[PDB]
């Protein structure tokens, strides 16, 4: 219950001239920690801190940058982790826990959720620091399956989610309106939800064109 | 513009010499028939008679257009002859474009190299060769009377392609609007 | 000498003209009305807002190449020189939009690009094609970094063909046209390989000569040749955070290298994952509803040995470019096969060619009545 | 069809079927392997139907369909009873 | 262009004809001089337009639209070329 409180000040800061000089790393950084604590997101608040760290490499913190990166991984597949990589210099990309979470983001965005949950520290300092991180990760796991998949196996969806069998499998199945299938699949989408042809419905190419041919 | 710069649009001279002010070629293709001229009331008196009980001849003409599209190549034979008007007129027009270039600059370029290679004449005597050379090619200024009807007949193709336009467009308009049953 | 003293003179002139346009473009409509009335040429006072802006963008990062850590010039440019011209009353001409373009020039140089929603929202002025070219040039980069290439590919084709109808004719660009043309070429070549065989977006902008060159490159990159990705990154890495040109390549000072590293380290990690995705999806969707035999046959091509064939294919399928499903009962891999059609590349040209007749009689019937 | 028309020829009549087709009398599917020779409806009605414009067919001429028939058949048929 | 307006007016006179013919017998004793004359020449409408109901004929004439647009398409490419040929003459 702190997001909309500081959102006004952050909105006023980001739509001004207070985002190029490293003098506003006392409000934006606290807003990144608020974003973490509430599971609500503002991208420019993170991007301003990243700019101030990139432009003058003298104020680059570890906790705040890691909160920025994890809050970018929660709101996938939005280009938040893009803008995270877009500023942090390779020298700063090899510090704890910036490098580890950059590797987590590399595995998440490419949809290597199995290798992510495996190589990831099952209990890290900042995964609990970001409220509903695990929720937001498994939402993004289920997002790509909801968009670009038809029918998943009982084990295969639990494998995609990571380190589950049936309990949290069914919790994430019944959440996104996914049914069961006979011996033995989880009904994600229909068998007609694959092809989705975008434009073979061309060449009604007369009516509105002959409006610019009458003369 | 024709009327001002006269006589008349002469070919080898007096062509570009009037295309300097540049005569307009197609201008005021005048309107034709708009008003009830009152040579009509008697034609209306035959119209009403043939719209009435004697409606055999009015419907004859209505029915007559049924077979102008049945067997005629309204598009195919026309776009054929107009395309062979393109290949003959427009392409020999382009050969005229290369040939007036074979003279004004191409030949002229080494007429210039004929003038320049002798230090532009001798101090004490002629200057025979310089005066003898630049023998002006038979086109000295665009050959712009072939090219007059040139423009007018490449625009004959324009109003012939505007023909071909309203042929295909409103025929296939009637197809995709009417058939769908 | 001959560089830094001239750079300082130029910067001072740009801050002077930034103050002059910051003062008399909020309340006053007297000097604006004087400038509309007395000097008949509308050219010069719209030229200044680009001529000064491009050399200021140059000189700022030129100085920053030395003052890398604790930089003055970018803070002097953005907050004082650009934002002072940005956040004001719009000059009712081609000045108001060019002030937003002058800020967006440095707003793109800095990789802090998110106000694309605001910059286009507050740009409610008549989008004259001169400004529209620079709009689709700068806004295009936001859509490129938005990782939505199916939408971003359409933007760069407008600026790269240059059918936008820009005719000035008073050196407005200025002095750097082939640089912007080559930059649009490289950004379009980057967008081409990321989606092929979906586009079918590379006929318009650059035609069959360089299309076949970048096409052979595009096939090599997708088949697994990393040399094409290397070329594509190397030719584009300056084009992201180049001002117009650096100061002077020296060996003694270590300052000039630090921004060049900042340019290299940023736009590599982004495009390396795109190059991997290009090879992941490379293989054409030959068949839709595959059985277990040649499912394992195409699992071989995806990634074999051995371990972790199934999970790796799953990872390669979850990339927003492979909609498929497994029927465990029947053992049936039901996949998509997304293809498109061509013929309607002759639809926007029929109007272009009607205006190409008008174009045929623009200059020539100008001559005609300057000749009579 | 070779039985339908018992002329002196079998071979030269078959290549007289195609000779008529190639030299623009009618429309047939010439040299089918299983030898099914359909005539179609109508697919190439331009000038090789009536060979060329003058018909070789007395009061048979069955319904083919093509251009402008749309407008003028629609108003002919309308106005016969009006 | 406006023979389409004439063809429209003709097709609506046919409609207003057919409507009163129906609705006159819809009440009682109408469509006397229409049943197998205007009805004979209502199936004579669908004799020539439409073609029975072939969606391969829809495909045929939208493929003809592709053809006919492309005939006038290069007609307009010649339109531009008329100016680029004979008006380079005017330099």
Of all residues in chain E, the one with the smallest CA distance to C344 is: E66
Instruction: Give Cα B121 to chain centroid, integer Å.
Output: 47
- Number of H helices and E strands in chain E, helices first, is 3, 0
CB A203 within 8 Å of CB E65: yes
Question: Which is nearest to C205 in space by CA: C304, C345, C333?
Answer: C345
What whole-number distance in Å separates Cα of residue C318 and Cα of residue C302? 13
Phi, psi of C356 (to 5 degrees): -75, -30
Dihedral sign, CA of B97, B103, B107, B108? negative
Q: Given strand A185-187, what is the order of strands in its sheet?
A: A151-153, A185-187, A179-181
What whole-number distance in Å separates Cα of residue D60 and Cα of residue A2? 90
- Ranges of H-type helices in B100-145: 101-104, 106-116, 129-132
Nearest chain C Cα distance for residue A90, angstroms: 6
Among E61, E71, E86, whose Cβ lies nearest the Cβ of B164?
E71
What whole-number distance in Å separates Cα of residue C105 and Cα of residue C99? 10
CA atoms within 13 A on the CB side of C87: 9
E91 contacts chain C (CB < 8 A): yes
CB A21 within 8 Å of CB A42: no
Question: Which is nearest to A43 in space by CA: A5, A87, A1?
Answer: A87
CB A188 within 8 Å of CB A145: yes
What whole-number distance in Å separates Cα of residue C185 and Cα of residue D53? 57
Q: How far apart are the first and last CA of chain E?
A: 38
Token pair listed for C82: 């650009």
- Ranges of H-type helices in A3-132: 3-14, 28-38, 43-55, 63-74, 81-85, 98-109, 113-119
CB A122 within 8 Å of CB A104: no
What whole-number distance in Å separates Cα of residue A150 and Cα of residue A145? 8
What whole-number distance in Å separates Cα of residue E44 and Cα of residue D73? 7
What whole-number distance in Å separates Cα of residue B82 and Cα of residue C161? 33
Token pair listed for D61: 């001429």
E86 contacts chain B (CB < 8 A): yes
Q: Do E49 and D74 touch (CB under 8 A)?
A: yes
Diameter of chain C measured on Cα atoms: 85
Q: Do E83 and C357 touch (CB under 8 A)?
A: yes
What whole-number distance in Å separates Cα of residue A61 and Cα of residue A98? 10
Resolution of the entry in angstroms: 3.4
What whole-number distance in Å separates Cα of residue A46 and Cα of residue A84? 8
3-state secondary structure chain C: CCCHHHHHHHHHHHHHHHHHHHHCCCCCCCHHHHHHHCCCCCCHHHHHHHHHHHHHHHHHHHHHCCCCCCCCHHHHHHHHHHHHHHCCCCCCCCCHHHHHHHHHHHHHHCCCCCCHHHHHHCCCCCCCHHHHHHHHHHHHHHHHHCCCHHHHHHHHHHHHHCCCCCCCCCCCCCCCCHHHHHHHHHHHHHHHHCCCCCCCCCCCCCCHHHHHHHHHHHHHHHHCCHHHHHHHHHCCHHHHHCCCCCCCCCCCCCCCHHHHHHHHHHHHHHHHHHHHHHHHHCCCCCCCEEEHHHHHHHHHHHHCCCCCHHHHHHHHHCCCCCCEEEECCCCEEEECCCCCCCCCCCCCHHHHHHHHHHHHCCHHHHHHHHHC
Q: Do chains D and C touch (3 or more CB pairs under 8 A)?
A: no
E interface test, pick of A200, A201, A202, A206 with most E CB neighbours within 10 Å: A206
Judging contacts by C-beta atoms under 8 Å, the chain E residues touching residue A205 are 65-66, 69
Other C-beta atoms lying within 10 Å of the C-beta of residue B131: 9
Judging contacts by C-beta atoms under 8 Å, the chain C residues touching residue B21 are 371-372
Judging contacts by C-beta atoms under 8 Å, the chain D residues touching residue B75 are 67
Token pair listed for C343: 């013929």
Judging contacts by C-beta atoms under 8 Å, the chain A residues touching residue E66 are 203, 205
D interface test, pick of B52, B59, B68, B70 with most D CB neighbours within 10 Å: B70
Token pair listed for B29: 């293709």
Of all residues in chain A, the one with the smallest CA distance to C200 is: A199
Place of tokens 């439409």: E50
What whole-number distance in Å separates Cα of residue C298 and Cα of residue C126? 53
Token pair listed for C250: 């020296």
Question: Which is nearest to A107 in space by CA: A71, A81, A142?
Answer: A81
Token pair listed for C193: 């390989």
Question: Which is nearest to A112 in space by CA: E55, C357, C277?
Answer: C277
B interface test, pick of A204, A206, A208, A214 with most B CB neighbours within 10 Å: A206
CB D68 within 8 Å of CB B171: yes
Judging contacts by C-beta atoms under 8 Å, the chain A residues touching residue C318 are 111, 144-145, 148-149, 160
Q: What is the DSSP string of A139-173?
A: HHHHHHHHHS-SEEEHHHHHHHHSS-SSHHHHHHH
What whole-number distance in Å separates Cα of residue B102 and Cα of residue B118? 24
Nearest chain A Cα distance for residue E75, angstroms: 11
Give the method used.
cryo-EM
Dihedral sign, CA of B35, B39, B45, B47? negative
Nearest chain B Cα distance for residue C56, angstroms: 47
Chain D touching partners, 3 or more CB pairs below 8 A: B, E
User: Parallel, antiparallel, or unpaired: how do β-strands A179-181 and A151-153 relate?
Assistant: unpaired
- Count how many pairs of residues, chain B against chain C, have C-beta atoms within 8 Å: 6
Nearest chain B Cα distance for residue A156, angstroms: 50
What whole-number distance in Å separates Cα of residue A114 and Cα of residue C220? 30
What whole-number distance in Å separates Cα of residue C290 and Cα of residue C326? 10
What whole-number distance in Å separates Cα of residue A22 and Cα of residue A26? 10
Phi, psi of A180 (to 5 degrees): -100, 155
Diameter of chain E measured on Cα atoms: 79
Whether a cis peptide bond, with omega within 30° of 0, leads into C306 is yes
E77 contacts chain C (CB < 8 A): yes
**DSSP for residue A181:** E
CB C135 within 8 Å of CB C155: no
Token pair listed for C43: 């050219």
Q: Do B20 and C368 touch (CB under 8 A)?
A: no
What whole-number distance in Å separates Cα of residue A96 and Cα of residue A72? 17
């Amino acid at each position: 219950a702190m997001f909309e409180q500081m959102r006004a000040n952050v909105g006023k800061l980001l739509k001004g001239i207070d985002r190029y000089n490293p003098e506003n790393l006392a409000t934006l950084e606290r807003y990144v920690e608020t974003q973490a604590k509430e599971n609500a997101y503002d991208l420019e608040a993170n991007l301003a801190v990243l700019k101030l760290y990139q432009f003058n490499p003298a104020f680059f913190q570890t906790t705040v940058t890691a909160q920025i990166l994890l809050k970018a991984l929660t709101n996938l597949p939005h280009t938040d982790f893009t803008l995270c990589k877009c500023m942090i210099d390779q020298a700063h990309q090899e510090e704890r826990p910036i490098r580890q979470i950059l590797y987590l983001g590399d595995l998440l965005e490419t949809c290597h959720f199995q290798a992510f949950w495996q190589a990831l520290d099952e209990n890290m300092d900042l995964l609990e620091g970001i409220t509903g991180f695990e929720d937001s990760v498994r939402k993004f796991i289920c997002h790509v399956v909801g968009i670009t998949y038809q029918h998943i196996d009982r084990w295969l969806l639990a494998e995609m989610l990571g380190d589950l069998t049936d309990s949290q499998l069914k919790m994430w199945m019944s959440k996104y309106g996914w049914s069961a299938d006979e011996s033995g699949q989880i009904f994600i989408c229909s068998q007609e939800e694959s092809i989705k042809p975008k434009n073979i419905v061309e060449k009604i190419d007369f009516d509105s064109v002959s409006s610019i041919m009458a003369s | 513009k024709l009327m001002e710069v006269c006589k008349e649009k002469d070919f080898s001279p007096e062509a570009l010499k009037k295309a300097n002010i540049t005569f307009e070629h197609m201008f005021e293709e005048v309107p034709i028939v708009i008003k009830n001229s009152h040579l009509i009331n008697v034609l209306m008196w035959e119209l009403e008679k043939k719209s009435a009980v004697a409606d055999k001849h009015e419907l004859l003409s209505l029915a007559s257009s049924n077979h102008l599209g049945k067997n005629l190549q309204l598009l195919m034979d026309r776009v054929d002859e107009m395309s062979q008007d393109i290949v003959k007129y427009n392409t020999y027009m382009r050969n005229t474009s290369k040939q007036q270039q074979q003279k004004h600059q191409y030949q002229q370029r080494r007429q210039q190299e004929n003038m320049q290679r002798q230090s532009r004449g001798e101090p004490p005597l002629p200057e025979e060769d310089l005066s003898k050379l630049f023998k002006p090619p038979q086109p000295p200024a665009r050959m712009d009377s072939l090219l007059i009807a040139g423009q007018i007949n490449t625009y004959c193709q324009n109003i012939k392609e505007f023909t071909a336009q309203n042929l295909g467009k409103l025929f296939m308009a009637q197809a995709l609007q009417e058939y769908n049953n | 000498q001959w560089l830094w003293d001239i750079i300082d003179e130029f910067i001072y002139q740009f801050q002077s003209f930034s103050q002059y346009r910051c003062k008399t473009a909020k309340k006053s409509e007297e000097e604006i009305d004087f400038l509309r009335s007395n000097p008949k040429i509308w050219n010069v006072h719209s030229v200044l807002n680009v001529l000064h802006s491009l050399v200021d963008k140059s000189n700022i990062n030129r100085q920053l190449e030395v003052y890398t850590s604790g930089g003055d010039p970018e803070s002097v440019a953005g907050e004082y020189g650009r934002h002072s011209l940005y956040k004001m009353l719009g000059y009712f001409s081609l000045v108001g939009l060019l002030r937003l373009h002058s800020l967006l020039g440095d707003y793109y140089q800095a990789i802090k690009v998110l106000e694309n929603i605001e910059l286009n929202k507050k740009s409610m002025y008549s989008r004259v094609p001169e400004c529209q070219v620079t709009t689709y040039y700068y806004v295009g980069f936001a859509y490129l970094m938005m990782r939505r290439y199916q939408d971003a590919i359409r933007v760069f084709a407008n600026i790269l063909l240059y059918i936008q109808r820009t005719k000035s004719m008073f050196q407005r660009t200025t002095y750097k046209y082939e640089m912007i043309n080559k930059q649009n070429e490289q950004m379009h070549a980057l967008l081409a390989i990321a989606l092929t065989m979906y586009p079918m977006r590379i006929d318009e902008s650059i035609h069959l000569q360089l299309r076949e060159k970048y096409g052979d490159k595009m096939l090599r990159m997708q088949k697994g040749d990393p040399q094409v990705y290397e070329e594509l990154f190397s030719y584009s890495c300056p084009k992201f955070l180049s001002p117009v040109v650096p100061n002077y390549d020296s060996v003694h000072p270590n300052y000039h290298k630090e921004p060049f590293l900042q340019q290299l380290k940023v736009f590599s990690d982004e495009v390396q994952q795109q190059a991997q995705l290009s090879t992941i999806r490379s293989f054409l969707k030959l068949y839709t509803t595959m059985p277990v035999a040649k499912l394992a046959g195409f699992l071989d091509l995806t990634e074999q040995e051995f371990r972790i064939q199934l999970l790796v294919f799953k990872h390669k399928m979850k990339n927003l470019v492979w909609t498929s499903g497994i029927s465990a009962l029947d053992g049936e891999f039901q996949s998509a096969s997304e293809v498109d059609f061509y013929i309607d590349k002759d639809m926007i040209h029929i109007a272009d060619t009607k205006v190409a007749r008008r174009y045929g009689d623009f200059f020539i019937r100008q001559i005609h009545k300057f000749e009579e | 069809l070779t039985s339908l028309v018992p002329f002196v020829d079998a071979f030269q009549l078959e290549r007289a079927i195609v000779d008529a087709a190639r030299h623009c009398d009618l429309q047939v599917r010439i040299d089918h392997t299983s030898r099914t020779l359909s005539f179609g409806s109508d697919l190439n009605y331009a000038t090789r139907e009536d060979a060329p414009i003058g018909p070789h067919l007395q009061s048979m001429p069955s319904e083919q369909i093509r251009n402008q028939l749309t407008a003028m058949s629609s108003v002919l048929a309308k106005a016969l009873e009006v | 262009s406006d023979l389409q307006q004439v063809g429209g007016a003709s097709a609506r006179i046919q409609d207003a004809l057919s409507t009163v013919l129906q609705y006159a017998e819809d009440v009682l004793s109408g469509k006397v001089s229409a049943d197998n004359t205007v009805g004979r020449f209502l199936m004579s409408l669908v004799n020539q337009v439409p073609k029975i109901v072939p969606d391969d004929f829809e495909t045929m004439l939208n493929s003809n639209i592709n053809d006919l647009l492309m005939v006038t398409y290069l007609a307009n490419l010649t339109q531009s070329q008329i100016a680029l040929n004979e008006k380079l003459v005017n330099l």
